[PDB]
Amino acid sequence: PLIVPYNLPLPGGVVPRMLITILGTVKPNANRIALDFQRGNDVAFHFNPRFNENNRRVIVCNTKLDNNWGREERQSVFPFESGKPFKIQVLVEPDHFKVAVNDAHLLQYNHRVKKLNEISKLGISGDIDLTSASYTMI
Numbered sequence: 001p002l003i004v005p006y007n008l009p010l011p012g013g014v015v016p017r018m019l020i021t022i023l024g025t026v027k028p029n030a031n032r033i034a035l036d037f038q039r040g041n042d043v044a045f046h047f048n049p050r051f052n053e054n055n056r057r058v059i060v061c062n063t064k065l066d067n068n069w070g071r072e073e074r075q076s077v078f079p080f081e082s083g084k085p086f087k088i089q090v091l092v093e094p095d096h097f098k099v100a101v102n103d104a105h106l107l108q109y110n111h112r113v114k115k116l117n118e119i120s121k122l123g124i125s126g127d128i129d130l131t132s133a134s135y136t137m138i
């Protein structure tokens with residue numbers, strides 16, 4: 001187990017067929033989780049499960065460019081549960097990130113930041129116990 005926030009380096013950025021796996025357990029009474037794939041200060045892909053946004057659960061996805069958030073993409077399908085272990089898998093594809101949670105497909109997010117080879121850090125934050133963060137090619 002590791003303590004969050006945690007920064008996972010992605011040396012040389014990301015590339016298609018790179019699979020990033022984040023394992024952890026959601027705390028009881030969690031409010032939020034955040035994964036931030038960063039190109040310097042820009043956030044290419046922000047993946048933000050919110051456990052209570054207006055009394056519902058939603059996943060918010062976005063990009064931050066020059067410190068400004070863009071247009072959000074929201075997913076109501078919500079595979080996380082307070083107190084339960086999870087696996088987030090982010091598969092880099094040519095035109096999008098593909099996310100699966102607990103071995104079930106969840107969402108795709110098209111690349112807004114084009115320079116994949118400069119998306120060189122993944123930040124992991126929020127109401128979790130972090131078990132592991134790693135990557136491999138498939």
Ligand SMILES: Cc1ccc(S[C@@H]2O[C@H](CO)[C@H](O)[C@H](n3cc(-c4c(F)c(F)c(O)c(F)c4F)nn3)[C@H]2O)cc1
Nearest residue numbers: 032033034046048060061062063069070072125126127
């Ligand atoms: C016009 C406008 C008005 C309001 C908003 S709200 C905004 O929405 C964004 C996604 O579009 C991001 O989610 C932002 N955000 C969340 C975290 C964060 C964090 F700082 C942590 F320390 C965590 O542990 C954690 F899990 C987090 F999520 N940082 N920035 C959010 O402030 C947008 C536009």
